[PDB]
Design a binder for this molecule. Structure first.
Ligand code: A1L5Q
Ligand code: A1L5Q
Lengths: 487, 150, 140
């Protein structure tokens, strides 16, 4: 079985390398995978299942996951073992409904700090075995990320119904306080989110240093996670810089001028800028950078739910199909870029000379042309974007024709993409989803505490089994072949 | 009473199965509606992600924004929901202040949200095309037989 | 046939419970449903159809509806009985077109209070049998 798995790897690699006889090498790799699956299929006892799943630690399951042997890992003979290991030391929860499991997740989320504090006695405690199970690790991580999302949402509190004060008006706790001190100071929720992000960043840094930057970047989703944390760090660094500037102004104001009120004082313009509202902030202010990057980070923060969905049964194939569609998108989206850039440059060249002449400046510059032709995909761009105030009907008519052709091209490419990635669709979906869920399961087997809480510190019996299994496989294959050729 | 009147015409699902032409019609509609919820959960996830992200971005510009569409939680939800059907204007992410960083990030996030809605819509359509395949005939006859036995 | 139907129920329930060998249990349930359908298929008289459709009141049809045995209930051998019972005490309306049926519905709608008032004498009246039919209940 190991020989067949390594041979499947070699055949897949040679199929990728050759690109001429790719069909033949792929067929040979499928033959090796089918042989492995057939050998696994003939199991009749847990001992034989274990012997196939690892030699003399699910070594063979991990090695098949590495080689993308979907049918060997999604086979019920392996799923029965993976579920027993996954629900280790807590078997009663396996038969409960999804609602009970969600209730368990909520219970863990509510009492996560309490169980984390009690984890010190857990190795000598009965509940430590439960908390060390491969499932309660996943529930702990999921409840942890849900708590992080709740912290992100609750940070934006006091503004759900809108800010009570207009941007043009400054509010100070005391008259001598700088407004930027009031607006840049870290709240306790922000300080907790900072610890949260540093914990996740430390976990990812440890993983990267253990593995290696090259194959770390090779995974697309790990790159997205690292970029998310980097964006969080950049936003908090910009916020910290704004806080430093504000507190420097605060030190200065009490350092030199000694008056009962700050309004009557003619502060130096460098310090006086810190007593301004949003209307007078520089476009490149550190707080503006911080808010923009923090908004991007919050948008990307809810994408970690792709670590939780595969464990579920209903939304597993959902995420698998979404990932397949997203992977199929990029090939068509390159051609989208090509055609979009063609029309964007063509219309920009046409309308660049009518900056003030056009009634609506939508193609006069490169940025407006890009904006208008992008929003034309969703219909949010008005049709009056190609009409002028001058009586140059030639340019206007050519703009109308080019805009119509661009819209027709977008429609044609959209329908072409939809049709092609319908045809590209065809228990393959079932085995693919089970393979993804098995990868998720094996990710937690051997990572005990959540990110924020991780900072704190007579040949052989196996040969006999394999010989029996191979003898059975040979007999079954011969029986099947001769039974189909009895005549 | 208006909500009740809207829901009152839904009882026609008790009359349609007896008919022969509209039986499989209602069966297919029910199958599609059942398939919707699984994708609609992910719709909620992505929609809430972008809704909170844009609300956090634009919450500080209540009076600064030319059109208050993301300044509060309710306006952000309204605008991003109506963006699915195209009824929300593109001028919802442009400010009156010269803070081009926030405005540009809002434009980028809005474009990414629209692209995500398109991608998820096509993914749902393709998946519940593939999920489709006299099975329809026997299913419709079973539903009509349940109606008869009722 | 009852044993096969209960076994199909048990196999479907175990397919839901296990979630590991769900394919095998679903295949076994399909085998039981196919056996039930095949037993129903060999009918050649109304007596045999009735005997399969209920034991010693469409008991087996109801029990198959409860177990989602789609092919046993949608089989023509069962549909012929369900239509005869459905169009009971009014057989001429079965062969009429959809337009005639809609006209009957409109006629009932126009005179619904009148027939409701006359329903007091309906049990002793000829028209009470028509108004008590399984179809005129649906039209009403
Ligand atoms: C690709 C879409 O682009 C567009 O929206 N357009 C392209 C053509 C433009 C235009 C401008 C003008 O001044 N005139 N004057 C006339 C008489 C026509 C005319 C219009 C239609 C036809 C036809 F229907 F027979 F084809 C024949 C002649 C005409 N068209 C309007 C915007
Ligand atoms: C996702 C859709 O989001 C949107 O609608 N946008 C995102 C970008 C925004 C913007 C703002 C600006 O000030 N400028 N200035 C320049 C020079 C560009 C520019 C535009 C396009 C290109 C490209 F076409 F080559 F890619 C290169 C540079 C530009 N863009 C406009 C709104």
């Amino acid at each position: 079985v190991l020989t067949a798995l390594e041979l499947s790897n070699e055949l897949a690699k040679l199929a990728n390398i050759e690109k001429e006889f790719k069909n033949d090498y792929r067929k040979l790799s499928m033959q090796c995978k089918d042989f492995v699956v057939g050998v696994l299929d003939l199991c009749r006892d847990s001992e034989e299942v274990e012997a196939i799943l690892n030699g003399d630690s699910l070594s063979r399951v991990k090695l098949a996951i590495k080689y993308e042997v979907k049918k060997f890992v999604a086979h019920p003979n392996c799923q029965q073992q993976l579920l027993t290991i996954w629900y280790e030391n807590l078997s009663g929860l396996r038969e409960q409904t999804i609602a009970i499991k969600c209730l368990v997740v909520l219970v863990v989320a509510l009492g996560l700090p309490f169980l984390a504090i009690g984890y010190w006695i857990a190795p000598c405690s009965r509940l430590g075995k439960i908390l060390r199970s491969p499932f309660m690790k996943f529930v702990a991580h999921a409840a942890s990320f849900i708590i992080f999302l709740g912290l992100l949402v609750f940070n934006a509190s006091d503004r759900f119904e809108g800010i009570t004060t207009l941007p043009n008006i400054t509010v100070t706790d005391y008259p001598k306080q700088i407004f930027r001190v009031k607006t840049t100071q870290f709240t306790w929720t922000e300080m907790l989110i900072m610890v949260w992000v540093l914990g996740m960043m430390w976990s990812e840094c440890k993983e990267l240093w253990l593995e290696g930057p090259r194959e770390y970047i090779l995974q697309l989703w790990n790159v997205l996670d690292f970029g998310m944390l980097s964006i969080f760090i950049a936003a908090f660094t910009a916020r910290f810089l704004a806080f430093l500037q504000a507190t420097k102004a605060q030190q200065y104001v009490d350092s030199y001028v000694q008056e009962s009120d700050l309004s009557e004082v003619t502060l130096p313009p460098e310090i006086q800028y810190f007593t301004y509202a949003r209307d007078k902030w520089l476009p490149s202010d550190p707080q503006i950078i911080s808010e923009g990057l923090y908004a991007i980070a919050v948008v990307l923060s809810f994408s970690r739910i792709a670590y939780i969905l595969p464990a579920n049964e209903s939304f597993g194939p959902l995420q698998i199909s979404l990932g397949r569609t997203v992977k199929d998108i990029f090939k068509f989206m390159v051609l989208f870029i090509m055609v979009f850039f063609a029309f964007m440059i063509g219309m920009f060249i046409l309308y660049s000379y009518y900056l003030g002449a056009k009634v609506n400046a939508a193609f006069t510059t490169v940025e407006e042309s890009f904006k208008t032709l992008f929003w034309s995909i969703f219909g949010l761009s008005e049709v009056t974007s190609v009409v002028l105030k001058y009586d140059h009907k030639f340019i206007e008519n050519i703009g109308y024709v080019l805009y119509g052709i661009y819209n027709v091209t977008m429609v044609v490419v959209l329908l072409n993409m939809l049709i092609a990635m319908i045809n590209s669709s065809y228990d393959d979906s079932d085995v693919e989803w089970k393979f993804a869920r098995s990868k998720l399961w094996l990710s937690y087997f051997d990572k005990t505490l959540p990110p924020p809480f991780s900072l704190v510190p007579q040949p052989t019996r196996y040969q006999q089994i394999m010989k029996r299994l191979i003898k059975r496989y040979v007999l079954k294959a011969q029986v099947d072949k001769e039974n189909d050729e009895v005549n």
